[model samples]
Each structure stands twice: as structure tokens, then as C-alpha cells.
Target chain A: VQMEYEKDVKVAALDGKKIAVIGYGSQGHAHAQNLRDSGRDVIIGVRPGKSFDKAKEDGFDTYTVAEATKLADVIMILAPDEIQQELYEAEIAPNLEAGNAVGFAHGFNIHFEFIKVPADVDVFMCAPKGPGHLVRRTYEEGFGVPALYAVYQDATGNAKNIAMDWCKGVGAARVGLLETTYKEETEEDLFGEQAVLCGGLTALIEAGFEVLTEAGYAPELAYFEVLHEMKLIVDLIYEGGFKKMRQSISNTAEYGDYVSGPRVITEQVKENMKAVLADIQNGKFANDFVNDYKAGRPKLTAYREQAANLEIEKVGAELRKAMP
Target chain B: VQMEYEKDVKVAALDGKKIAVIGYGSQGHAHAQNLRDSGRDVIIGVRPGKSFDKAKEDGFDTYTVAEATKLADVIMILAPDEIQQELYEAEIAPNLEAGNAVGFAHGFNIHFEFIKVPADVDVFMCAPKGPGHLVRRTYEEGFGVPALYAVYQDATGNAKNIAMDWCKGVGAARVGLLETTYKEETEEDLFGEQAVLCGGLTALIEAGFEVLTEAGYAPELAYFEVLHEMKLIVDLIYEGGFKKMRQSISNTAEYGDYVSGPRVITEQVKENMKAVLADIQNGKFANDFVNDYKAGRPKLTAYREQAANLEIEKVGAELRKAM
Candidate 1:
């Protein structure tokens, strides 16, 4: 990847711009605080709630979405994916003026065509590649997490400049910026979440637990093998990789990993993973998720309840207390 | 899952017993130090090496395996699984006396019939559930890591008492104890390591990494998405379970997990895991491991070289430096 450093970014481009951060959740809090600390004129936009109180207490000029959008030159919607549609239509789009730029941390609503803005406005994205706490904490430590930025609509011809300026405001320019298209970012992000990080990993672990318990092994032992010991293994892998982990574990374990790992995650499983990715790329998964949300989340709620009642969950709750 | 506490175990049974810890590796140091701190007479047994020097520096009375075995009332072998047979035959078995107890932290050799002691000797095991560092650190903090103890032979009929005493000496009774058989411990331990913890986890992550990168995603992005983020997810799960983790992640990610997780790890994958367990249970895996070691580890060496050359490892090594 081509990494654009701080020297390559134009940080002063947004100096006179007012940025309205349209949420006060994890990312919103970090982005607003960091931008304000970096001398950017920033305000928060949210419906009154605990988060609204939090933003006000943090000393930001907080307002409802319509007011913030009406007063600012840039509006960044940091609300949840399921609610972004209604939020944009009800308060944001009508209040937005021509020549005002719009931004997002994720490309879900824009790339999926859920909220199309007017032609005169610039549309861009600046996503810090980490959780909010790390984004803010690392910035305070004199470095920052890297980020990805892209311009989907550049009617003003200064979309790239504005994107880099926003990255600098959020402390990402101190590290690096990866330039990507909205389609690439959205599709890859969704695929990664479903095919690898969250979905594939938890499923692999739960399956391992199920296999042991089905064969009559003690639930406690299975919990340790499949779930409890995962932290140490993942920590090692995260710090380095499988090589570092293999170096630390016993030779017996290394050999078993080489031998049995393939047995469990076969070519067939890879094909299955590819299929999951296809669903994301084709918008099938998105449609199903949004539809579930619209239907009072019947599917998501049922799945959550089923997952909570799993034998591993019950065993883990008891075992974690022992260690903690 | 019968739980055994300090009351169920005779913790004071080994008050006057001389214990010889038969290695100075990770587990060995912890066992020797904790037993010594718990008021039992403990010594180190190993060939002259770096570990021998470390034992000496730690203020333990060090000896060769034969000498330590001859001097102690109980000998606990904490050496690696592959080398135990030769170590026992060369230095330990000849020096063992009738009625003296022999012990192990793992049951690989005994359960596999590789190390058979005389009929008059007692055999037991005392294995802490966590790493040796946790074993020592927790004990020093006035608690201890849980442990498992089992008896394979009980010639003196005090094998159970001796096992519990050793557990107590290492501070395991301060937490809890789980009673098991040598067979169960050996089979379950091998299966767990192979089928889930080490083998299954690394393989799963590697597969995920490959899936992302092969689909034209940036290798660095793939690394972050599949491997780096795993630590955060696991930390949440470790603190509680899947529920806690789900609560912390984005709704998009959680929904993706619920929808696509099962599509990736289907019933076929569980069946494959069962087959891995079967190999462990029937001693096929053990026999293969020993044969590979005896033949100078051709398969193991080749596998390591191949794994080292994997794209994910190289990308990870460089990207880890960056992060």
C-alpha cells in the first residue's frame, strides 16, 4: 500500500472549516475531542440522551442534528448503521447547504446507496483503523493509529484535500493514510468482519468446544482448550504471528497444529468462507441484516438468545470467575 | 466433574517428605520453588546445563537425575515428553528404590507404556492448570492456580495422599483440585492441545488470513482484520464469554458473526475435529510423534520450515514491527 505521511497531507485546509460530528458514541467522542484538541472548530450533533449529556460535559458545542448541520460547513454522520437512514433524512440532508462537505467513518450507507446527498456537496470518508480508545490514546502518546480515506463525490474538486485535512485533525496524519475507493473499503470491511475476524473465529472456537463436549469430555476441560486459552495464543499471534506462537508452545503442539489444523479447516471450509464473502459483496447479507432490523430484529434477537444459551457460554461464565 | 478442595485432600501428608523435582524448565522451577516455600524439602535434578546453573542460582540443591532420584522420597519428572523415556532409562529408573514414589506433571510416557516402573513403587501426577509463571506468581500472592492430580499406581496405598500432598506443596490446594486418572489426563490433554488450543486456533487464523489476501484485499489489511483484532475479541471472551464480546463489538460485526460464522465452521468441521480427537485417544498420534522423534524429526523439521515460509508469517513479522 502507498502510505501518505503527514508531510504529504495538507492539514491547514480545514483551518477555517466548522466540522459537525453527528454522534457521540465511541468513535464520535474520540474524533470530536481529538479534532478540538488539534484546533479544529468542532461541534456534536445528537438527540438528547446519555451520550448528549456526555458530549456537553466534555465541553463541546452540542446541538440536535438539524441545528448542527445547519451551522457547520462539514457534517460527519457517526450514528449506527441501522438508524443512519432515518437520521440523515429527518435532520441532516434537509439542513445541509450546497458546497458543504459530508463525511463518514464507514462507507456502509453511502456505498449501499441508502442516503444520496445533493450534487453540489463533496462526499468523503476518513476511517481510523482502530477502536476509538486507541485512536485517542495513541494520539495522546505522540503517535496515532493509521487510517483510510476516500472521496466518493468530489463536486467541489477539493475532496481529497478535505479528506486529508480531516485525517490530520483526527491524528491519523501523524501515522499514515491508505487511499481506497468507497466500494473497496465497504466490501472488504464487511467481508473481513464476516469471513475472518469476528464470525469465522468465534465459529471455529465454538465448533471445537462442541466436538469435545459431544465426545463426553468434561465441559471445564473443553472450555479451557477451546476458549479460555485463546487469549494467550491470540496475544502471541497478534504480537508477531504463528511463528512466534509456535516458538513459544511445546513442539508437540506445533506438530499437532501443522497436522490437525488442516484436517479441521479443509479446502471445503475455505469455499464456505468464500461464499460468505460473496454474500457481502453482492449486498445479500446487508439486505438480510437491514430487513431483520426493520422487522423488529426477529432474526438478530433470536440468534442472540440462542447463542447465549449455548453450553460453552454457561460453562465459561462459571470458569471466568475462578480465574478473575 | 467432581470438585476436590483442601478438605478432600490430605495437604499435610508430605510434611517430612524429601521431594526431588526432576527438571528445571518452566514448570520445574515453579514446582521446586513453590514446594520449598511451602515447607517441603525440594531439590533439582538435571544434567549440567544452563538450566542447571539457573537452579543453582535459585539456591536449590542441584543434582543429576540419578543422584536426586536416589536421595529423595519422591521424584517428579517435569521434562519434555519426547526426552522422558531416555532420561528415565539412563538416569532415573536405575536409581529408584522400592516404595519410593515417582511422579510426573504430564502422563505421556506412563500412559503410553514408555516408562514402566517397578510394582512396589507409587506413581502420581501434579499438574497446575496455568503456566508455571502463573503457578508461582499466584502462589506468592496468597492464592494458586488450580491443578489436576492423578494416580496410575498405588503400591503403598498412600498414592492418593502423596498426590494431594504434592499438590498442596505446590499451592494447588489453596485454589482447587480435580481428581482424574492418568489415562484421562493424558488423552484429554493431548486432544485439547491438538484439536483446539494450539492446532485448531492457529490453523483457523491462518485460513482466515489466506481467504482475505487471496481475494485481493491488501495483505496488511488482512493481517489487521484477521489477526491483530483477534486479541481484543479474545480478551473480551476471556473476561466473560461470547456474550460479553458480542456486546462490545459493533452491531455490524456482531450481525455478521451470527450470520456467517456457522457458514464457515459447519458440521463437517466439527466432524474433522472429532477425527483429530480419535487419533489422540487411540494413541495413533502418540506413536507417530515418537516415531518422528526417533527418526530425527524429519517431518517436524520440514513442517516448521514450510510454516516459516508462509506469506502470513512474513507479512505479520514486518507489520508487527510497524504497529
Candidate 2:
């Protein structure tokens, strides 16, 4: 549970490390470029049939996933959840050497036991808290995005040390680093993104929109109340906290916060959140997601189609067009 | 109602009229300053009060409310809800001239029959759809914030025309203006502010915070989940509407939206909103608020005291300090 990164905080071992960044997606692009900019040798790996000419156009010396793993001293898997296992099985496992290191920005496939690595190889995770743009922007500003690191397999004594060094090399040392287990980081992160950050909050706003519009409030008025006005409240909450936000708003609103907020969320909602966490912990959500991917992502596509056609979204699009 | 603003659809009547702006709070200050800046001669009315200094410092030529009402061609009242009736009775109604215009930014006092204006005066409203800062910011950006305008009285045939001129003077003409009745504007505005925008959303966030923290999640993580990340979601909603936001987020989240949102905001919650509105419509909320104010605001103070001590407040303060 404790990290011994204090004594071995130096980036001395990172100078000559050959870092093979797999995939050129959001996180991959940022990590590979940042690692190269920090004076480490970097290469990007794209699959043989994958039409990733952009990686080659940018002078990355791209190769198949297996070929890169054979040559590079460290292979960081920056691909999406569904693609990781197949790439690891066909390209990665055959080429991964005993003394080489394997890296991941997320622990999904590995944490759920979908992907297993050789015991002699070092495996660790170096995850920046923000998305790729922020990671790149922070590095450009001579500071780094804060990150979390965990060592799942520290075969050599240098496993943990190398993970911390990788975090530092990508400019994460300038901000700060937090020590977390793969289990803790993976579960909490997936749940929060799914249940609260992206899922629950958007659902709350759209529901508020429907309630008002259905009850005969003008779509304009409903939009203002349920959506446009939320920006002010959230900004205050972000900068100053909930109490400060409450204090700054009208007494009527503050009173409403005390009186109505709990009425909406209720006990059942919290119970639902607990159930969400349970699914995440039990790996059901991940299993379903991977299955959808293996079947050409049918469920994800269906959900996206239905969500895009919701009434509130149609109304919102017209409203935004009106703003301009 | 159909708006003819594009076809010179004047919502209220104001033609070559001198205007007096009373008080200088958020709505008051911005309304007065923007009107003056738009080439209308605007005088600030302050009746020997503390807001007088604030108004004077903002460079408004000042007079007592009584004196300003007596001399102005048109008087727009922007005073607080609790004091509007008393202020109008003492200073405005007695001095109003036949065929003069009277206006308000909110319809609360008028719609609820708290302050009855003179029969000879044309009465109307021009309610900006944003807070004062936004009103001012939009005007400065060479764009006017959208507004809702309603004419309550038209002693002369030009009441709606005067409302349009007033809207133009305040820069709402640059954006679009819409037609609303004093009744619709008053009821929806009060209900929306109290129930959803200002009321329900905050309460929902607070409940989420309490649930998580009480269930032993770290306050930091709880704040992030229930508070900090709210802005990103809201910004998406505001800019592109619900569908655009849904498209941008993941499928896991979209599935949750369909499943969990209704569980959170149940039938009981809708009934709570309806109940809140019922009090507003029945005059009970206003009466209680006014009576509380009459007793030197004891009820309001007591409610505020409880809010000041809430756990979210302390956590918010520390988090904001770090930011």
C-alpha cells in the first residue's frame, strides 16, 4: 500500500529508455510526444491493417504492435479498452522480453485479468488525471499534469522506480504525483466517470429540462433554467465550493438548496450509486463492454443513436444556433 | 403570443420621454447605467438611503424618490420586493401625471396586486433573461441580452411602442425580445428562480454531497463528483444542447442517463416543485416573506444561520481557498 518512491525519485534511468507508444489516439499521442520531448527515444506502434498514416506522417517510425515491443525497451499500451487484449495477445506477448517494462495509462484489461504478462517483465501504470490536451498543454507551459502511478508487477527492484521515473519524464513531476493501487484507481475512476461526472450530472440537467418544458414553461425559459444558468452555479461551485456558491446566490436559492436538493436525490439514488460501484467492482460492466467490442460494438452504437435523438437535444441545438 | 419585434413589434410605449431609474442594485444599477449609455437621459432616485451613495458613486444624477417621480416623464421602479409597495405609495403614485409611463424589471409586486399604479399611467415590464452582470457584459460586447417584455396597461394606444423604445434604450433590442404577459412572466420567473435554477439544482448537488460524504467517501472525491465536474457537463448542455453532449460522452454514461436520472428526480420531487409554485401563486410565500421583513427579517436570518453552518459550506471554503 505504501510507495518507496522517495529515495529513488531521480529520472537518471529514463535518459536512454526506448519508449514504444502503442496507438496514436488522444492519450497515446500526448504520452509519446511528451516522452520524446523529454529527451527519451520514442516510437509509435500501429497495427498492420490500421490506416494510421498520421503517425507515420509525423515522423514516429511506426510499426506493428508486436514489432515495436521487440525493439523498444518500454512498451506503453495507450490503446482503447477493447483493442488492448487482442493487440497484447497477437503482437505484444510474443515480443515482450524478460527484462523489458510494460506500461498502461489505464488498468482495465489488466486489472480485470483479461491481459496477463510474463512474470520476468516489469509492469506498471502511469496515469495523468486529465485528458491528453491538458497533459500536452501543461508540459508546454513548463509544468506537468498531475498523475497517479502504480506497480502491479515489480519483478526487478527497478519496477517501481522506473514507473515513477516514467511519470517524471512525461513532465508529471512538475505538478505532483499520488500513489494508488491499480484496483483502487481503476474502480473509482471508472465508476466516477460513468456514474457521476459524465453520466449522472448530464442526466440530471436533461431531466430538469423535461420537467419544466412538459409543465408548460417555454422551451427558451426551460433552456435558461435547466441548462444555460447551470454554468454560473457550477463555476462558483468549482472555484469556491458548494457553501460559497450557496452564500453568493439569492436567499431564495439558498433556501431551496437546503429544502429541495435532498428531495430530488433521495435515498434510492444513493442505493443506485452503490449498485453501480458493485457492478464496477464485480467486472460485469467491463465484461459487457469488451463483449460489445468483440461483436463489432453493436450495443455502444445503439445507445449512442438513441441518446442523440432525444427531444432535449433537438431543442438544445436550435437554442444554441439562436445564440449565435 | 406572436412577437412582431422584427416588424417593429414594440412591446411597450415610450416616445421622447425623460426616465427616472430607482435604486442601483444588480438589476437596478445595470438597468439605469445601460439606459443612460444608450442616449436616454436617466436620473437615479434615492430617498435618503444607503444605496444613495452607491448610486451617486456610479455617476447617476440623484434625487429623492418623491422628487424624481414628480419631475420625470417616465419612472421605472427597480426597488426590492418588500419595499416596492411602501415606496410607490409614498413617492410615485401620488405624483404620477396623466398618460405618463410606469415600468418594472419584475412583475411580482404588480402581478400579485401589491402595488396598484395610477389608471392614467401606462404600465409595462422589460425583464432581461440574465443577471445584471450578464446584461452589462452582453451590452458591452455589442450584443444585447434577450429579454421578455409585457404590457400590463395601455392608457394610450402606444403602450407597447413605449416598451419597445425602452427595450432598445437598454440594449435588449440588439438581441431578440419576446412577448409575454405580466401574468406568465411573473409566475414562471418566480417559479423558475425558486424551484429549478436557483432552488432545485443546488439542493440536488448538496444532497449528492451529503450522501457520498456520509457514506464515508473522501470529501475531496465527493466534491469532485457532485460539484467540481458539474461545470463541464453544464457547459456542454448550454452550448450544444442535450444531444450534442450525449454524443460526446461515453456509452456507459449515456446508458446511466436513461436509467438513473429518473430514479433521482422522482414523482415526489416534481410534487415538491409544484408545491413550491402553489405557495407562490397563493400569495402565501410573498406574505410570509413580507411579514418576515416587517419583523426586521428574523425568519430570513434564522434560515441563513442554519445554511452558514452546513458541512458543504466549510468544505467549499477550503476547496475554493486552494483554487
Q: Give the number of the best model, judged by DockQ.
A: 1
> What docking class should model 1 receive?
medium
lDDT of 2 by residue, A171-220 (tens): 88666566666876677566665555555666665666666666676776
Residue-by-residue lDDT tens digits, candidate 1, A135-236: 899888878888989999998888889999889988998887778888878877887778767888788888878777788878887787777767777777
Docking class of 2: acceptable
| Whole-model lDDT per candidate | 0.85, 0.72
State the lDDT at A131 in candidate 1: 83
lDDT of 1 at A19: 90
lDDT of 1: 0.85
Taking all chains together, each candidate's TM-score versus the true structure is: 0.93, 0.85
Please give the range of 10 consecutive residues that has the lowest summed lDDT in model 2 chain A.
A1-10
